[PDB]
Amino acid sequence: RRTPPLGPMPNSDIDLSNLERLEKYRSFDRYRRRAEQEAQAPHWWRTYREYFGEKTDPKEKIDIGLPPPKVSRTQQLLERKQAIQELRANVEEERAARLRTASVPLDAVRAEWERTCGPYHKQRLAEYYGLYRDLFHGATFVPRVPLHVAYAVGEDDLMPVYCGNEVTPTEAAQAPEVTYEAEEGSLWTLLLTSLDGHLLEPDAEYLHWLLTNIPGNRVAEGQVTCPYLPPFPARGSGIHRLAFLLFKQDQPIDFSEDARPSPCYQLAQRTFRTFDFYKKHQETMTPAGLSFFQCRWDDSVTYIFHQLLDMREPVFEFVRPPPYHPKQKRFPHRQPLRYLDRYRDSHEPTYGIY
Amino acid sequence: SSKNLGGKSSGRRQGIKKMEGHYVHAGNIIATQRHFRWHPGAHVGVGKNKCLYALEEGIVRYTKEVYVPHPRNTEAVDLITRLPKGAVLYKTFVHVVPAKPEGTFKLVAML
């Protein structure tokens, strides 16, 4: 009784003859690189990757964004060769490299990272947090234009929302200082939603800030179709994620069926869905910027529930499932004396009929 | 006249207690063994005597994964450096795919 394999056996391609004329793994990290290379392949037997919740990932995902701007890679490569050749000409750089003392201008590499490869990194961070999973039902994009939104609390500092930061709702008390590059022919729709925080509905989300037809960089001039409202994560619930979205529209499109009243303090009205909202405006606009941050409870959230929303604050708690015990035996053989205490409800003395 | 004497030791009852697909509560022993046969995978620990017990409530799954030893495990490291430049090892692993979420957020007070 045997059964043949359903495909190639793993160590079968090497030849068992002429073993001493083969190259061995002379190290441990060489084998480690080969084994972690091999563990990524789609094998035909049963593997760890099949069972442990990888969401059945192979299926192409729809891009909805701006195209990549065309660059001539030959000229770029020759100019970069020119630049590193000019840096390699200096000899004090060689002294700094040999002498283990040569730092990097972190702000310059920060702005350059924002300039060249940063959009793809922000795309994979936005997909790690599940933004594209809950904003567009899986449809992905790249945040082509950079964006800078900074929050205002005190006098000197800032608390910026980078991709994935943590800002407290006290620091999110007022509207932030939104800036980005734009030309004088473009209109923009700003949109700030919290992916979590809806109480009545599990899959909906709360619209907090919507500005439409931003004339380029004039962020103040847009029409306030939804007024700014601070975040409000509840107490016992965990971390809540707010996300800004910046779309670029070709022609100036107006909408009043999505517009809200001027207080807008009724939570049934702020029941948003970015999938349906992007479905309505599928052709006129396209997403171009993206920023998002974590938000947990502080003592100003009860102020938000008190004087703005006019409600009592709901608190939560992280409960666990009750512990597992077998069926209670009548004669528990060799169990300890505390076996009876696992099945008791109240640890106070009881007197039945007396 | 019976020069040999001594081999009267009984069987150890070792082997797999939970096969693939069996629901397993936390702390159930999955397999007893000597001289490692099934290796521990995700959410499976080992005892001193190489028994395999669950660490979560779930369903047992047996797979076959690549074997990379700890770098201080010197005998396995020399067995690794003695392999040719394409071979990998593929031992057998036991996982527990956990069933319950580790908690839920309930509404306790509305104040």
Binding site: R1, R2, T3, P4, P5, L6, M9, P10, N11, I14, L16, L19, E20, W45 | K64, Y67, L79, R82, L83, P84, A87, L89, Y90, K91, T92
Partner: peptide, 18 residues
């Protein structure tokens, strides 16, 4: 197992002659 299609997937001493 010995009757499964993946029998002998963990074979290694046919690679080391020493």
């Amino acid at each position: 197992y010995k009757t499964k299609p993946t029998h002998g997937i963990g074979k290694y001493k046919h690679l080391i002659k020493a």
